[PDB]
Amino acid sequence: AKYTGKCTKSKNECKYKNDAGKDTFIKCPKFDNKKCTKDNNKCTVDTYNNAVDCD
Ligand SMILES: O=S(=O)(O)c1cc2c(O)c(c1)Cc1cc(S(=O)(=O)O)cc(c1O)Cc1cc(S(=O)(=O)O)cc(c1O)Cc1cc(S(=O)(=O)O)cc(c1O)C2
């Protein structure tokens, strides 16, 4: 499943709702182009390949 969520800057985490609707918090990468740069920025998660991209 491909989901869109919101990331937090200080924890560099992506918050999204999983298959069941549960809030799920996962770590964005540190790499600049995939890290969270501002609270409530968009992030996406693909639950099959674990592609996590935070803005
Ligand atoms: O995110 S962490 O705080 O847990 C962390 C800190 C450091 C680390 O070396 C790593 C994680 C491992 C690591 C993870 C990733 S990731 O796969 O994307 O999550 C990437 C890197 C890495 O070392 C590569 C990397 C990227 C960047 S950046 O894209 O320009 O932000 C910078 C660095 C990298 O090694 C240098 C770096 C900076 C810093 S700093 O404190 O932010 O200056 C701490 C650590 C560093 O290795 C020290």
Q: CA 36 to CA 42: how far, in whole Å?
A: 8
| Among protein residues, the one whose CA lies closest to atom 37 of ligand 1 | 30
Output b/e per residue, 23-38; b: 16+ Cβ within 10 A.
ebebebeeeeebbbee
Give the resolution value in Å: 1.3
Q: CA 42 to CA 24: how far, in whole Å?
A: 14
E strands in 9-48: 13-17, 23-27, 41-46
Q: Decide yes or no: CATH 2.40.50.60 for domain 1-55.
A: yes
- Pocket test of ligand 1: the residue of 8, 11, 28, 30 to mutate, having most ligand atoms within 8 Å of its CB, is 30
Q: How far is CA 20 from CA 1, 24, 47, 49, in A?
A: 11, 10, 12, 18
* Residues composing the chain: 55
The residue whose two tokens read 């200080």 is: 10
Is the CB of residue 44 less than 8 Å from the CB of residue 4? yes
